[PDB]
Amino acid sequence: YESTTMPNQVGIPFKALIERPGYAGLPLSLVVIKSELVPSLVQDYITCNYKTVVPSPYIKCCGGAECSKNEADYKCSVFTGVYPFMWGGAYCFCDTENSQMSEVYVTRGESCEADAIAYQVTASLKAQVMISIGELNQTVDVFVNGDSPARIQQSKFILGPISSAWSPFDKVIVYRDEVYNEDYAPYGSGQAGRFGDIQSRTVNSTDVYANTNLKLKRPASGNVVPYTQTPSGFSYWKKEKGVPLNRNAPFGCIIKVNPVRAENCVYGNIPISMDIADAFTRIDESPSVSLKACEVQSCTYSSDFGGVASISYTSNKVGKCAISSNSATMKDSVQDVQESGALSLFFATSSVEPNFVVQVCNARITCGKCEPPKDIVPYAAKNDAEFPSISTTAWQWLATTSGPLTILVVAIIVVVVVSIVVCAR
């Protein structure tokens, strides 16, 4: 009744048969449409381009002054003896103790409503498996971690845990432009020598760690303030970027920004278990088949996933058996065979089958052919492992086997013959 462990490969139909002796049941075909890495994440920080805002000089005539306060982050220096005038250019009668409150603080732009959010991710795994019982075709989201029962069409499925499963995400930063795999250290970036100068606790924060430095000085000219200004590193670093998370993956993974996922990562194996509601009224149909043969056509040495071959047989038993196979993959799986001849079928060749044990019901042969050495000259591609397989060349290389035997017959004779001489006389 239950239990196969199928590999995760997308769009390729795995055939599982594991039912009671005598096949007359429903053959299980299962497809992975996509795998769906659903995050269980911690938000490290929000970062964005920033607008530092320096108010224009406010002076108060003569004497000292003192400053105070925070707006998000602040620096404040009160310059003194500002200006040199005494005629309404200081706006004062003093210029020896006259004071300027200069101040600067950090505000956030309008990029901050958009990119970018830093996540530590460890994803939890959801599958989007397609169940084909040969009578309906339907797909279903289900979490594949845990022991997770669902019944669909009133056939039980129990999804067993998924392990040995690739993770692209680690330290990652998700921009709206394109995801990038980048390392950082949160709440400890500042100044303008780095990308992600402002460090913010939340999306709509009021506290920011930045070390940004912009230097006011006292007016001492006929103009109106001297400034040396290092401006924002973020706008500069914006071009340079990291390196993409998208290209990161040995096999599959198209990383989608908006929900935060990776679709189609062909890794991890799903053990599956089922009670398909066997009995039924089994056994009461069971084709049998005779004269089993393999023809090979469409052998080209291009790497594609297709497969185009035929098998010749004859049937005289009218039925549907549960077909086919547990070391081979057909694209068909339901065939009412009443009579039979040549039957062309599609196969998943060079996908996850490079070998095939072809069954049509309880009956079987092993196939097939096409693997020449390096001239090229066709040969069979089955049975013994010799690496162009069974070939006139493979046999000719094997024929060293006689050499060790001839050198052994010479040793046996000489060892026995000495002992015999001493005895002889």
Binding site residues, other proteins, CB under 8 A = 247, 251-252, 294, 296-309, 347, 349-350, 354-356, 367-374, 376, 381-383, 385-389, 394, 397, 400, 403-404, 406-407, 410-411, 414, 417-418, 421-422, 424-425
- 5 versus 350: smaller Cβ distance to other proteins: 350
- 149 versus 306: smaller Cβ distance to other proteins: 306
Least Å from the CB of residue 372 to other proteins = 6
- 129 versus 367: smaller Cβ distance to other proteins: 367
Residue 159: HSE in the Cβ half-sphere, 13 Å Cα cutoff: 24
Least Å from the CB of residue 381 to other proteins = 6
- 185 versus 421: smaller Cβ distance to other proteins: 421
- 150 versus 398: smaller Cβ distance to other proteins: 398
**What is the distance between the alpha carbons of residues 369 and 297, in angstroms, rounded to a whole number?**
9
- 136 versus 407: smaller Cβ distance to other proteins: 407
Least Å from the CB of residue 416 to other proteins = 11
- 94 versus 394: smaller Cβ distance to other proteins: 394
Least Å from the CB of residue 424 to other proteins = 6
- 275 versus 295: smaller Cβ distance to other proteins: 295
Least Å from the CB of residue 161 to other proteins = 27
Least Å from the CB of residue 421 to other proteins = 5
- 219 versus 388: smaller Cβ distance to other proteins: 388
Least Å from the CB of residue 300 to other proteins = 4
Structure token pair of residue 328: 């081979």
Least Å from the CB of residue 353 to other proteins = 9
Least Å from the CB of residue 15 to other proteins = 17
φ, ψ of residue 79 to 5 degrees: the values are -85, 155
Least Å from the CB of residue 384 to other proteins = 9
- 243 versus 418: smaller Cβ distance to other proteins: 418
Q: 266, 121, 264, 113: which is closest to 179 by C-alpha? A: 121
Three-state SS for the chain is CCCEEEECCECCCEEECCCCCCCCCCCEEEEEEEEEEEECCEEEEECCCEEEECCCCEEECCCCCCCCCCCCCEEEEEEECCCCCCCCCCCCCCCCCCEEEEEEEEEECCCCCCCCEEEECCEEEEEEEEEECCCCEEEEEEECCCCEEEEECCEEEEECCCECCCCCCCEEEECCCCCEECCCCCCCCCCCCCCCCCEECCCCCCCEECCCCEEECCCCCCCCCCEEECCCCHHHHHHHCCEECCCCCCCCCEEECCCCEEECCCCCEEEEECCCCCCCCCCCCCCCEECCCCECCCCCCCCCCCCEEEEECEECCCECCCCCCCCCCECCCCCCECCCCEEEEEECCCCCCCCEEEEECCEEEEECECCCCCCCCCCECCCCCCCCCCCHHHHHHHHHHHHHHHHHHHHHHHHHHHHHHHHHC
**What is the distance between the alpha carbons of residues 366 and 360, in angstroms, rounded to a whole number?**
11
Q: 293, 296, 309: which is closest to 380 by C-alpha? A: 296
